[PDB]
Amino acid sequence: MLDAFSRVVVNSDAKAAYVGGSDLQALKSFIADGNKRLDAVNSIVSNASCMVSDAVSGMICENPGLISPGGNCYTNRRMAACLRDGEIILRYVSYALLAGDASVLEDRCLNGLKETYIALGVPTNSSIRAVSIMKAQAVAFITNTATERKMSFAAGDCTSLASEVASYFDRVGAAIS
Amino acid sequence: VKLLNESGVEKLVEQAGPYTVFAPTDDAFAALLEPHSFNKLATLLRPENNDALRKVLMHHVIPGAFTSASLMDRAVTVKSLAGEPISIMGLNKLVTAGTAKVVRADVPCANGCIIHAVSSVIIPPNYVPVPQPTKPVFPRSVIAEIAKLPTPRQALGLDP
Amino acid sequence: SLVTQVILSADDELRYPTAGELETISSYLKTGEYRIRLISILQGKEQEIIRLASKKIFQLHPEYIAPGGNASGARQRALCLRDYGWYLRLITYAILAGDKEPLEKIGIIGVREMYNSLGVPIIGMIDAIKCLKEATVEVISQEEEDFVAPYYDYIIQGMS
Amino acid sequence: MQDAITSVINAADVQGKYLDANSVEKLRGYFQTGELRVRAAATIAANAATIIKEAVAKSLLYSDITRPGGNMYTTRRYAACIRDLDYYLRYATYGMLAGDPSILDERVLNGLKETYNSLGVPIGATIQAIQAMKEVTGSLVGSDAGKEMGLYFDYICSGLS
Amino acid sequence: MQDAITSVINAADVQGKYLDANSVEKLRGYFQTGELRVRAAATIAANAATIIKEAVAKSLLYSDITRPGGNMYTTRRYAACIRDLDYYLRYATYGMLAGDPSILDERVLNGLKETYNSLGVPIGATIQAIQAMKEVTGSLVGSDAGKEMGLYFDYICSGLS
Amino acid sequence: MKSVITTVVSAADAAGRFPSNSDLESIQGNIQRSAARLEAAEKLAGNHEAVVKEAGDACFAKYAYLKNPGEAGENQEKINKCYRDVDHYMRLVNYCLVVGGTGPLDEWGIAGAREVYRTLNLPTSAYVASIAYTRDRLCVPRDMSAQAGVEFSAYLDYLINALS
Amino acid sequence: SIVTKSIVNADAEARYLSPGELDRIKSFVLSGQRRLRIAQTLTENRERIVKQGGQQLFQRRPDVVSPGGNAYGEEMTATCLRDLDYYLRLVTYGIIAGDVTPIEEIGLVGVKEMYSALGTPISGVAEGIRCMKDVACSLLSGEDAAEVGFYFDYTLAAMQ
Amino acid sequence: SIVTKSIVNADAEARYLSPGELDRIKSFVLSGQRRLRIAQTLTENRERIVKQGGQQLFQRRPDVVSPGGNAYGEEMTATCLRDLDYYLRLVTYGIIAGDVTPIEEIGLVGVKEMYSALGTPISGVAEGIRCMKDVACSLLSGEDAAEVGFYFDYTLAAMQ
Amino acid sequence: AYDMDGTGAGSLEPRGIKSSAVEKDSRCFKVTFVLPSQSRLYTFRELQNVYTTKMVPFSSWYAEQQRIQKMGGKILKVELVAGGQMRSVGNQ
Amino acid sequence: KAAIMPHQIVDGLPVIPNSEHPSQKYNVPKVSREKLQRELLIAQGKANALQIELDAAYTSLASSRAFLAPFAAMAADMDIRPLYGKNPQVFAGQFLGVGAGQWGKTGADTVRGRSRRVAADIGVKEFQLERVKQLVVDLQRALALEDAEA
Amino acid sequence: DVVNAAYPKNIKNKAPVISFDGKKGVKLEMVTLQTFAGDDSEDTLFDYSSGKFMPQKPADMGIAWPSGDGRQAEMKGGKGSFNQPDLRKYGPFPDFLKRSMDL
Ligand SMILES: *C(=C)C1=C(C)[C@@H](Cc2[nH]c(/C=C3N=C(/C=C4\NC(=O)[C@H](C)[C@H]4CC)C(C)=C\3CCC(=O)O)c(CCC(=O)O)c2C)NC1=O
Ligand SMILES: *[C@H](C)[C@H]1/C(=C/C2=NC(=C\c3[nH]c(C[C@H]4NC(=O)C(C=C)=C4C)c(C)c3CCC(=O)O)/C(CCC(=O)O)=C2C)NC(=O)[C@@H]1C
Ligand SMILES: *[C@H](C)[C@H]1/C(=C/C2=NC(=C\c3[nH]c(C[C@H]4NC(=O)C(C=C)=C4C)c(C)c3CCC(=O)O)/C(CCC(=O)O)=C2C)NC(=O)[C@@H]1C
Ligand SMILES: *[C@H](C)[C@H]1/C(=C/C2=NC(=C\c3[nH]c(C[C@H]4NC(=O)C(C=C)=C4C)c(C)c3CCC(=O)O)/C(CCC(=O)O)=C2C)NC(=O)[C@@H]1C
Ligand SMILES: C=CC1=C(C)[C@@H](Cc2[nH]c(/C=C3N=C(/C=C4\NC(=O)[C@H](C)[C@H]4CC)C(C)=C\3CCC(=O)O)c(CCC(=O)O)c2C)NC1=O
Ligand SMILES: CCC1=C(C)/C(=C/C2=NC(=C\c3[nH]c(/C=C4\NC(=O)[C@H](C)[C@H]4CC)c(C)c3CCC(=O)O)/C(CCC(=O)O)=C2C)NC1=O
Ligand SMILES: CCC1=C(C)/C(=C/C2=NC(=C\c3[nH]c(/C=C4\NC(=O)[C@H](C)[C@H]4CC)c(C)c3CCC(=O)O)/C(CCC(=O)O)=C2C)NC1=O
Ligand SMILES: CCC1=C(C)/C(=C/C2=NC(=C\c3[nH]c(/C=C4\NC(=O)[C@H](C)[C@H]4CC)c(C)c3CCC(=O)O)/C(CCC(=O)O)=C2C)NC1=O
Ligand SMILES: CCC1=C(C)/C(=C/C2=NC(=C\c3[nH]c(/C=C4\NC(=O)[C@H](C)[C@H]4CC)c(C)c3CCC(=O)O)/C(CCC(=O)O)=C2C)NC1=O
C-alpha cells in the first residue's frame, strides 16, 4: 500500500525527478494539519460499534423485504455476515483516512469484492445504501454535528477532512455497483 | 484515395514529377471479387500486409505524362515506381495499361500529371500473393528424421 | 504594438531578438495595466472631451461653421464630432500598444488625400487635433497627460 | 502580423469599438505572461543549434530518409533540413512573444504544404521532427513556457499537415 | 538535366549500391556511340540554317498558314518560326549528345503545348515541321546517327502533341 | 514501502483491529521527526548534480583499472551509466527521507542488486566508494543542520550495509 | 547602443523617433546608474572570472589543452585565456551600451572565419564563454544575473 | 559530368558547342575505357582503402576517437568509417563522370552545415579523406595516381 | 559558388538568405501570388499590377518566397515545372 | 480446452504501486453491456495495430544496421587511440566520469549511434503498446463480471 | 432511458432452445446468443492513441488566412459616443483581405 507521502514519491519516480520544493510544500502542509487528522480518526474509531448498528438496521428499516424468507439478511447467520461487512468497510476507510490515501481501499477492500457479491447473490443497491448511511455518520463526527454524542475538541474547523472521508465512501459504492 | 492515404503511397504521388496515374474506379475495386483474383489479392486485406499493398498500388504510377492522344497506335512499355515494366498500348482508339482497358480518357492534374480511369486493378507481373498466416510446426520426434536422412552407406548403394 | 515592432525588426535580419530588444519588450509589458487603467479613464471622458474640442476648433475657425464652409449644416457637423470620436478612439489604441502604428496604419497614412478629396482643409484638421490635445489636458491630471501628450503631437507631425 | 495587443486592438477596431473591460482580460492577461515569454525566448535563442541537433537525432536521423534514397540523403539535402528546422524553431519563438500565431501562416504556413509536395518532402517526417523539437523545447523553458512555445509548434504541424 | 551517365549514376545511387555490371554495361554502350554523336552534332551545327530552311520549304512554306490569315502571315510571325524551329533543332542536338531526353521536357516541353494554345499556334503544322526537319537531319548525319537525332525529334513531337 | 503508517496499518489489519492509541502515537513521531529529514530532502533535491559528480569520480580516481579493455569503465556509455547509478541511488535516498522509512531503497534499489552486479560484472566495492565518499564529506553545520545529518547519514550506510 | 540604433532605425524611415523610441531612451538613461554598477562588478573581477572561466573550460574540454589541442603548452594557454579576457571585456561594453552592438562588430561579426582560419575549435571557445557566464552570474544578484548572463548567451548563440 | 556541364554552358549562351567543347566530349569518351579501369580498382578495394583510411585518421587525430571525441565507442567509430565509405564512393563517381559534379551536389554542397550541426569536427573528416588518398594512390600507377588523388584533394579543398 | 559554403551565424558575410541550390541549378518553379506594395501612399510612385505568375528558379525561389511574405504577399499556387525530385546528380 | 482470459489473472495478482498503465477497473462508466464490447474490441484492434506497427519499425532497424555493417566491421580492426581518457596519469578532466547533468534520464539517449536511436524509438511504440495491452483487458474483465453477474 | 427494471440481468438467456438428439429427451439450454452487434457509439472509455498526433488545423476564414482576421465576428464591448449611422449599408462584407485593420 501507499500513503500520502509515498504517493508523491511514485508520481516523481515516473519522471525520475527529485522531490522538489513545490510538492514538498503540499507535504509540509500535510504534517502541519496532522494533529487535526489524528483528532479526526479518533472520532470515528471511538463510535464504530454504534455506527454499524445504526447503518444496517436503517437499511433494513427502509428495505423490509431483506428479512422476508428469500432475503439476503433473512436468518441469524446471514445477519452477522452483514454486520461483518459493516465493520470491514468501516475499518478500511479508517486506514485510508489515517494514511491520507486510497491505496489500502483499492487493492485490499475493493479487490474482488464485486465478483464475490455476484457469486453469493448479494443485492447490489442495498450495499450502496448502507455505505452511504456510514457516510452520513462519518461527516457528523468530523464536523461534530452528531445528535446525541458531543465530543470535545480544540477551536477550529475541519471541513476538508470531512470531504476527504466522504470521497472514500463514494469510492466504496462506485466499485460494487 | 483511401488506400493511398492508409498505405503511405499517397506521399509518392503527391510529388511534382510528371506522373500518369491509372487510378481504378471503385467498381474496379468492387470487381476484385473474382473467384480468380480474390486468391491473389484477398490476403492484402490483413492489416500486417501493407508491404505488398504499396507495390501493388505503386504499379499504377507511370513516370511521364502519357495522354491518350499521345498513344496514337503506339505501343510503348515502361516500369512503374514499383519497379517492374508495364506496357501501355493504344490502338484503334482504345488504350491499355496491362489489364486496364481505360474507361475515362484523361484528367488534367496539378504538376502536368494525368489521371486515367481504368476498369480493373493491375497486379504487377512478378507479384506472388502473400501466404495466409500459418502455424509454426515443429517435428514431434528426432528419431523419425535421423531415419529420414540417407546414410553414406545408403548413397553408395551398399544398403537398401 | 511594441512587441510587433521588435518581432518584425528582428525578423528582417533573420535573428532572434537581441539583449536590448528583449528589454524593450520586458519594460513595455511591465508597464502594462497603467495603459489599461489610463484608457478606461479616457473612454469615460470621450463625451467629456469632444464637447470641449468643438468649443475651440470653431471659435478659432468660424470659416468652417459659416454658410459656405464645409462644416456648415447639421449633418456635416454631426460627423464632425464623429471624426473626433474615431481619433480619440485611435489614441486609446496608441496609448495601449505603446507606439504609433495604430495612429499610423490608420488615420495618418494618406490622411491628406482623404481630406483633400473631401474638401476639409488639411490645415484645419491639424488645429482640430491640436484642439483635441488642448481639450484632453483639462479632464486629466498632470501625472498622466504627458504620458498621453507625445501620442497627440505625433498626429500633428503626421498631418503636415 | 498581429500580436495579442494588435489582435485585441483590431477586434476593438474592425467593429469600431473602444477598449471595453471584458476585452482587456486577455491583455491584463497578456501582460502577466510578458515576463514568462521573454525568458522563454531568451533560452531558445541561446540553445537554438542545440535544440535542433537534439530533435533530428531523436526523431529522424534514425530512419532511412537519412540513408540513400531517403529524403534527406545528400549533404545539400541534409543541410536544407537544419536550415529548414531553424525557421520552425525561430518563427515559433516569434509567435511565443507576440502571443498570436498570425505570423506563422503569414510567413511560414502559406504555400508550405503546397511546396513540400512539389519538392517531394515527406510531411510525415517533418511533423515528427517538429514534435520532437517541441519536446526538447519544453525541457529548456520549463512546463508552462513549454506549454506556450508548444502551443505554436502544433499550430505549424496542424496547418502543415 | 541528366545525360546517359547521369541517369545511370542516379539509378545506381538511388538504391545506394555501387555501379554493378548492369550499370556499367549501359555506360559502355554509351561510350561506344560517343564517337557517333559528336560528328552528328558537328554537322548539325554547321548546317543549322540550311536544315531549317529545308524543313520549312518542304513542310509549311506554301500552305495557307503562310498566306494572309494563316498562322505565320506577318514577318514578325514568320521570323518567330525559324527562331522557334531553331530551338527544336538545337535542343534535339543536346539530347543527341547527352543521350537522354530529360533536357527537352525540362527546358522545352513543359508549358509548351500550353503556350501554343494560348498564342493559337497550330500544333499540327508544328509537328510536321519537326517531322520534315527530322527527315533532313537524317540526310546529313547518316542513317544510324539520324536514328539517334530522330529519336529525340519525335520525343518533342510526342509531348508537344 | 515501509513507512510508519504502513507498518501500523498492516499490523492492525492482521489482527482485525481498528486504529487504536498505539497506532496514533506513532504518527505523532512522524510529525515530530519530519522537520529533520525534509530539510535533508530539500538540500539533496537542490544540489544533486554536484554531489553525484563528486562521488562519481571518487570511483574513477580510486579504481583506474576499470578503464582497461574488457573491464568495467571501457567506453563512454559505460561511464555514463556509472554516474546514472549514483544519481539513481541519491534519488532513492531522497525518496526515503520523504516517506520516513527505507521502503524506496528496499524495493527499488537493493532487492536484486547483488544478482545484477554479479551477472553484469560490476564491482560492488566501486559502488561503496561512491556512497562512502558522500557519507564522509558531509559537514554537519555547513551543509544541513545537526539532526539532518543523522537522517542523511543513516540512509547512506543503510545502503553500504546492504550492498556489502 | 540603444541610443544609436533607435536613431538609425528612425533615420532610415525618414521620420523622427516615436514615443516608443523616446520613452526608452528616457528609460535607458535612468537605467544608466544601475548599468555602471553591474559593469563595475565585472571590471575588477576579471582575475577570477577569467581564471575560473578557463578553469571549467579545460575540465570540460581537455582536448584543446592536451598535446595536439590548439591551446597546448605554456604559450597557447596564455592566449587561450587572452580571448576570454577579450570577450569578458566586450560584455562589459554591451552592459553599458544596453545592447550587443559593441559585441556585434567586435568579436562576433565574422568570428567563424577567424577561428576556422586559426585552427581553433569554435565550439571550444563557445564552451569557454559559458563557463565564464556561471562565474559571472554567481557574482551578482538575481536581478543582475538576468542581464550579465543575458549578454553571454547571445555571444554563445552567435558563436556557433 | 563533362558532358552535362559542357552542354549547360553552351545552353546558357544561346549557342551550340564549339570545337573546344566537342573535341573534349570526343576526347572524354575515348578516355572512358581507362576511367572504368581506374574506378574498378577502387571499387573492390574499399575494404582496405577505408579500413586503412581510418587507420591513419585515428593515429593522426586520436581526439575524435578518444572519450569525448565525436567518434567515440563501438557505435560512432562504425559511423566514423561509414562516411569514409561514402566519400570513397563519390570519388568513384567523379572518376567515371570525369568531374566533381557528382561529388559536388553529394557530400560537398552544404557539407559544413551538416558536420557543424552534428558536432563533428569538419577538419577531422578532412584529415580522414587525406589518409584515404595516400592509400588510394598507392594502389595505382603514376598516370592514374594523378587522377584518383586529384579528386580527393578537391574534396579536401571544399571540406574546409 | 553555391549558397552553403559554411556561412551561418557569426560569419563575415552578413546573415542572409541561404538556398539549397546546387552549382548552376536548372530547377525552376511556376508561382502565383499577389503582393500589395504597402508603400505607395507615402512614395506616390506609379502603380503596377501586383498579381503576377512567373517562373522563378530553384536557385532563388526560397529568397523570393521568403520575401513575398515579407511585404504581406499571399502565395496562391507554386509548382516545380522544370527539374526532378529526389535526384542526387543532374540538378545542374 | 478453455484458455484463461488475462483479466482473470489480474484479479489474482497482488497489487503493485507503479504500473506503466494503471487500470481503469473502477473508471469504466456504467454503459449498456454492448458498450463494453464496442470499447473492448477497439482496444484489441487498436492494440493489435501497434503490434504490427512495431513490425514496420523493426524492419527499419534491421535495414539501418545492414546500411552501416560494411563500415561497423571495417572500423572494428582500426587503431582508434583517443587524446584523453582511460587512465589515471593523464589529464581528462571532466572525462573521468561525466560533467554536471549530461548523463541523461536514461543513459542510451546520449549515447549516439544510428542503431541505437531507433531502439530508443521503440519506447514510443513498445511502451505505447503497453498501456494498450491493457485497455482491452478491463473492457473484457469488467465485461467478464458483467457476463457472470448476469 | 433505463426503464428496464422489468428486464434484470437475465434478459437474453433464451430458455427454449431445445435439442432432441434423437428420440430421447429435449436437452433444454439457456445459451445467450449474441447478435451481429457493433454497438455504434463514438468517443469510448479510453484514448487508444500513441502520438503520431498533430491533426489540428483552424477553420477556413475565406479569402484572408485562418484566425488572422475573424474581426468582423467578435463579441466586443463598447461603441463610442457620437457614431453617425451608415445609411447605405452595401452588404455585410466578409473577411477583409490578405490584410487586417492594422494595415
Ligand atoms: C428505522 C427504524 C431506522 C432508520 C431509518 C434509521 C434512521 C437513520 N439514522 C441515520 C443517521 C445516524 N445514525 C447515527 C449514529 C448514532 N447517532 C448517535 O447519536 C449515536 C452516537 C450513534 C449510535 C451509537 C449518526 C451520527 C447519524 C447521522 C445523523 C444523526 O446524528 O442522526 C440515517 C442516515 C441518513 C442517510 O440515509 O443518509 C438513517 C436512515 N435508524 C433506524 O433505527
Ligand atoms: C466461417 C463462415 C467458417 C469458418 C471460419 C473460421 N476461419 C477461422 C480462421 C482462419 N480463416 C482463415 C482464412 C481467411 N483469413 C485470411 O487472412 C484470408 C485471406 C488471405 C482468408 C480467406 C485463416 C488464414 C485462419 C487462421 C487459420 C488458423 O489459425 O487456424 C476460424 C477460427 C478463428 C476465429 O474464429 O477467429 C473460423 C471459425 N469456420 C467455419 O466453421 C465456418 C464454416
Ligand atoms: C559505475 C559505478 C559502474 C557501473 C554502472 C552500470 N550499471 C549498469 C547497469 C545497471 N545498473 C542497474 C542498477 C541501477 N539501475 C537502477 O534502476 C537503479 C536504482 C534505481 C540502479 C542502481 C541496472 C538495473 C542495470 C542494467 C540496465 C542499464 O543499462 O541501466 C551498466 C550497464 C551494464 C553493461 O553494459 O555492462 C553499467 C555500466 N558499472 C560499471 O561498468 C561501473 C563500474
Ligand atoms: C403433429 C404435429 C404431427 C404428428 C405428430 C405425431 N407423432 C406421432 C408419433 C410419434 N412421434 C414421435 C416423435 C416424438 N415422440 C417422442 O417421444 C420424441 C422424443 C424422444 C419425439 C420428437 C415418435 C417417436 C412417435 C412414435 C412413432 C412410432 O410409433 O414409431 C403420431 C401418432 C400418434 C401418437 O403416437 O401420438 C402423431 C399424430 N404427425 C403428424 O402427422 C403431424 C404433422
Ligand atoms: C495520539 C493521538 C493524537 C490525537 C487525537 C491528537 C489530539 C490533538 N488534536 C489537537 C488539535 C486540533 N484538533 C482539531 C480538531 C478538531 N477541531 C474541530 O473543530 C473538529 C470538530 C475536530 C477534528 C475533526 C483542530 C482544529 C486543532 C488545532 C489545529 C492544530 O493544533 O494543529 C491537539 C493540539 C495540537 C497542538 O497543541 O498544536 C492535540 C494534542 N494529537 C495526537 O497526537
Ligand atoms: C479613422 C480615420 C478616419 C477619418 C477621420 C475619416 C473622415 C471622413 N470625413 C468625412 C466628411 C466630412 N468631414 C468633415 C469635417 C470637418 N469639418 C470641420 O470643420 C472640421 C475641422 C472637421 C471635423 C472635425 C465635413 C464638413 C465632411 C463633409 C463634406 C461633404 O461631404 O460635403 C468623410 C466622408 C464620409 C463621412 O463623413 O463619414 C470621411 C470618410 N474616415 C476615417 O476612416
Ligand atoms: C575582441 C574579439 C577578438 C578575439 C576573440 C580575437 C582572437 C585571436 N585569437 C588568436 C590566437 C589563439 N587563440 C587560441 C584560442 C583557444 N585555444 C583553445 O584551445 C580554446 C578553444 C581557445 C580559447 C578559449 C590559440 C591557441 C591561439 C594561438 C594559435 C596559434 O598560435 O596558432 C589571435 C592571434 C594572436 C593574437 O593576435 O592574439 C587573435 C587575433 N581577436 C579579437 O579581436
Ligand atoms: C554522401 C555524403 C554524405 C555524408 C558525408 C553523410 C554523413 C552523416 N554522418 C552522420 C553521423 C556521424 N558522423 C560521425 C563522423 C566522424 N567522427 C569523427 O570523429 C570523425 C572526424 C568523423 C568521420 C571520419 C559521427 C561520430 C556520427 C554520429 C554522431 C552522433 O551520433 O551524434 C549522419 C547521421 C547518421 C546517418 O544517417 O548516417 C550522416 C547523415 N551523409 C551523406 O549523405
Ligand atoms: C519560413 C517558412 C519557410 C519554410 C519552412 C521553407 C522551406 C523550403 N524547404 C526547401 C527544401 C528542403 N527541405 C528539406 C527538408 C526535409 N527533409 C526531410 O527529410 C525532413 C522531413 C525535412 C527537414 C525537417 C530538404 C531535404 C530540402 C531540399 C530539397 C531538394 O534539394 O530537392 C525549399 C527549397 C529551396 C531551398 O531550401 O533553398 C524551401 C523554399 N521556406 C520558407 O519560406
Angstrom distances, CA of residue I35 to CA of B113, C101, G82, I53: 29, 21, 52, 11
For ligand 2, atom 20: residue with the closest CA: B43
Contact E133, E49 (CB under 8 A): no
| Main-chain phi, psi angles of C90, to 5 degrees | -65, -35
Show Cβ contacts of residue K10 under 8 Å, excluding neighbours closer than 6 positions.
J150
Helix segments in chain F, DSSP class H? 6-14, 21-32, 34-45, 48-54, 56-62, 76-99, 103-105, 113-119, 124-136, 146-163
- Closest-CA residue in chain G for H67? G63
Sequence spans of domains, chain F: 1-164
The helix (run of H) or strand (run of E) holding residue J138 is helix J135-146
State which of C49, C109, C120 you would mutate to test the pocket of ligand 6, scoring each by most atoms of that ligand within 8 A of its C-beta: C120
**Other beta carbons within 10 Å of B132:** 8
Collapsing DSSP states into helix, strand and coil, what is residue J37? coil
Bridge partner residues of B97 (DSSP): B88
**How far is ligand 4, taken at its centre, from the CA of residue F46, in Å?**
92
D57 vs D54: CA distance, rounded Å: 5
Question: What is the C-alpha separation between D112 and H70, in angstroms, rounded?
Answer: 35
Report the alpha-carbon distance of residue H46 to residue J133 in Å, rounded. 48
Which amino acid belongs to residue D12? A
Rounded CA gap, G42 and G132, in Å? 11
State the Cα–Cα distance between residues G154 and D47, nearest whole angstrom: 10
CB-count burial class (<10 Å; 0-12, 13-18, 19+) for F88: middle
Phi, psi of H141 (to 5 degrees): -70, 180
Contact H10, H21 (CB under 8 A): yes
Beta-carbon-side half-sphere exposure of residue J101 (alpha carbons within 13 Å): 5
State the SS3 of A102-147. Answer: CHHHHHHHCCCHHHHHHHHCCCHHHHHHHHHHHHHHHHHHHCCCCC
State CA E124 to chain mean position distance: 17
How far the first Cα of chain I sits from its last, in Å, is 12
Q: Are I85 and B111 within 8 A, CB to CB?
A: no
Contact D138, D146 (CB under 8 A): yes
- DSSP label of B104: E
Determine if residue G111 is left, alpha or beta; phi over 0 gives left, psi from -120 to 50 gives alpha, anything else beta.
alpha
Largest CA distance in chain E: 61
Calculate ∠ Cα I20-I23-I25, nearest 5°.
Answer: 75
DSSP string, chain H: -HHHHHHHHHHHTTS---HHHHHHHHHHHHTHHHHHHHHHHHHTTHHHHHHHHHHHHHHH-TTTTSBTBTT-HHHHHHHHHHHHHHHHHHHHHHHHHTSSHHHHTTTTTTHHHHHHHTT--HHHHHHHHHHHHHHHHTTS-HHHHHHHHHHHHHHHHHT-
Whether H93 contacts chain I with CB within 8 A? yes
Give the number of whichever ligand sits closest to the CA of residue A140: 1
Classify I28 as helix, strand or coil: strand
| CB-CB contact of B97 with B71 (8 Å) | no
Q: Closest to H78 (Cβ–Cβ): which among J68, J84, J94?
A: J68
Å from CA of K17 to ligand 4 middle: 20
Residues whose CB is less than 8 angstroms from the CB of residue I18 and which lie 6 or more positions away in sequence, other chains included: D83, I3, I4, I7, I8
Please give the C-alpha separations between residue F110 and each of F7, F102, F116, F124, J16, in angstroms, as whole numbers. Answer: 19, 10, 10, 12, 17
Do the Cβ atoms of J110 and F59 come within 8 Å?
Answer: no
Experimental method: cryo-EM
Q: Does I15 touch chain C if contact means CB atoms closer than 8 Å?
A: yes
Run of H or E including B77: strand B74-79
Strand order across the B94-97 sheet:
B74-79, B85-91, B94-97
| C-alpha span between G47 and G136 (Å, rounded) | 12
Which candidate, A77, A75, A71, A172, places its Cα nearest to that of A130? A172
Pick the closest to residue F94 from A12, J18, D142, J106 (CA basis): A12
CATH number at residue A91: 1.10.490.20
> D17 and K80 in contact (C-beta within 8 Å)?
yes
Q: How far apart are CA E110 and CA E125, in angstroms?
A: 19
Helix (H, G, I), strand (E, B) or coil at B21: strand
Q: Measured between alpha carbons, how far is residue F149 from residues A119, D19, E76, F143, J136 in Å?
A: 56, 60, 100, 8, 50
Contact flag I16-C14 (C-beta cutoff 8 Å): yes
Q: What is the 3-state secondary structure (H, E, C) of chain D?
A: CCCHHHHHHHHHHCCCCCCCHHHHHHHHHHCCCHHHHHHHHHHHHHCHHHHHHHHHHHHCCCCCCCCCCCCCCCHHHHHHHHHHHHHHHHHHHHHHHHCCCHHHHHHHHCCCHHHHHHHCCCHHHHHHHHHHHHHHHHHHHCHHHHHHHHHHHHHHHHHHC
Is CATH 2.20.28.120 correct for F1-164? no
HEC assignment per residue over chain E: CCCHHHHHHHHHHHCCCCCCHHHHHHHHHHHHCHHHHHHHHHHHHHCHHHHHHHHHHHHCCCCCCCCCCCCCCCHHHHHHHHHHHHHHHHHHHHHHHHCCCHHHHHHHHCCCHHHHHHHCCCHHHHHHHHHHHHHHHHHHHCHHHHHHHHHHHHHHHHHHC
Residue with cell 504517493: A7
Cα nearest neighbour of D70 on chain E: E14
The distance of K89 to chain J (nearest Cα, Å) reads: 54
CA atoms of H99 and H157, how far apart (whole Å)? 15
The x, y and z cell numbers of residue A69, run together, are 424468507
**D74 CA: distance to closest CA in chain B (Å):** 18
Does C82 contact K84 at a Cβ distance shorter than 8 Å?
yes
Beta strand I28-34 pairing with B114-117: unpaired
Q: Which of J17, J96, J103 comes nearest F80 by C-beta?
A: J103
| Main-chain phi, psi angles of B77, to 5 degrees | -105, 170
Ligand 1 pocket test, pick from A131, A147, A169, A170 with the greatest ligand atom count within 8 Å of Cβ, gives: A147
Report CA dihedral (A105, A107, A108, A111) to the nearest 10 degrees. 100
What DSSP character marks residue C67?
B
- I touches which chains (3+ CB pairs under 8 A)? B, C, D, E, G, H, K
Task: Residue A85: give the domain boundaries.
Answer: 1-177
**By the CB < 8 Å criterion, does I75 face chain K?**
no
* Cell numbers that stand for H35 in this block: 576511367
Residues of chain C whose beta carbon is less than 8 angstroms from a beta carbon of chain D are 1, 3-4, 6-8, 11, 16-17, 22, 25-26, 28-30, 32-33, 36, 39-40, 43, 46, 86, 89, 92-93, 96-97, 102, 106
Helices D75-98 and D123-141 pack at an angle, to 10 degrees, of 50
| CB of G79 closer than 8 Å to CB of G139 | no
Decide: C41 and C148 in contact? Cβ < 8 Å: no
How is the beta sheet containing I28-34 ordered, strand by strand? I51-57, I28-34, I74-82
For chain A, the domain total comes to 1
What is the nearest CA distance from I81 to chain B, expressed in angstroms? 7
Rounded (10°) CA dihedral G104, G109, G111, G116: 170
C-alpha cell, H68: 569525448
The partner residues of I78 in beta bridges, in order of sequence, read I31
Give the C-alpha separation, D141 to D43, whole Å: 7
- Nearest alpha-carbon partner for F26 in F43, F45, F3: F3
CB atoms < 10 A from the CB of B107, how many?
12
> Resolution, rounded to a tenth of an Å?
3.3
Q: Which residues of K45-60 are buried (b: 16+ CB within 10 A; e: fewer)?
A: bbebebeeebeeeeee
Residues F49 and J100: beta-carbon distance below 8 Å: yes
All cell numbers assigned to D85: 528546422
Cell 540603444 belongs to residue: G2
CB atoms within 10 A of CB E50: 11
How many CB atoms within 10 Å of residue C105? 17
The residue whose grid cell reads 481505360 is B102
Sign for the CA dihedral angle at E25, E26, E27, E32 comes to positive
Chains B and G are in contact, defined as 3 or more C-beta pairs closer than 8 angstroms: no
Beta strands per DSSP E along chain J: none
Q: Which residues of D touch E (CB under 8 A)?
A: 67-69
**Cβ proximity of A83 and A52 under 8 Å:** yes
DSSP structure class, residue A66: G
DSSP conformation class of I54: E
User: CA-nearest residue of chain K to I73?
Assistant: K98
- I89–H102: do the CB atoms touch at under 8 Å? yes
Chain length of chain C: 160
Contact assignment for A45 to F99 by CB distance below 8 Å: no
G158 φ/ψ sector (left φ>0, alpha ψ -120 to 50, else beta): alpha
Grid coordinates standing for H114? Answer: 551538416
> How many Cα neighbours within 13 Å face the side chain of I35?
16
Which residues in B lie closer than 8 A to residue I81 (C-beta atoms)?
111-112
| Amino acid identity, position G73 | G
Ligand 2 centroid to B37 CA: how many Å? 19
Q: What is the dihedral of CA B69, B74, B76, B82, to 10 degrees?
A: 40
**Bridge partner list, C67:** C69
Atom of ligand 3 nearest to the CA of F92: 20
Residue B49: closest C-alpha in chain J? J52
d(C-alpha C84, C-alpha C94), whole Å: 15
Count how many residues are written for chain D: 161
Query: From the CB of residue A125, how many other CB atoms can be counted at a distance below 10 Å?
Result: 10
- How is residue G69 written as a grid cell? 589541442
Question: Quick one: CA dihedral C72, C74, C76, C81, positive or negative?
Answer: positive
C-alpha cell at J132: 494498450
* Residue for grid cell 464475490: A116
E161 CB neighbours in chain B (<8 A) are 67, 69-70
C-alpha cell at A25: 510544500
- Do D and C have ≥3 inter-chain CB pairs under 8 A? yes
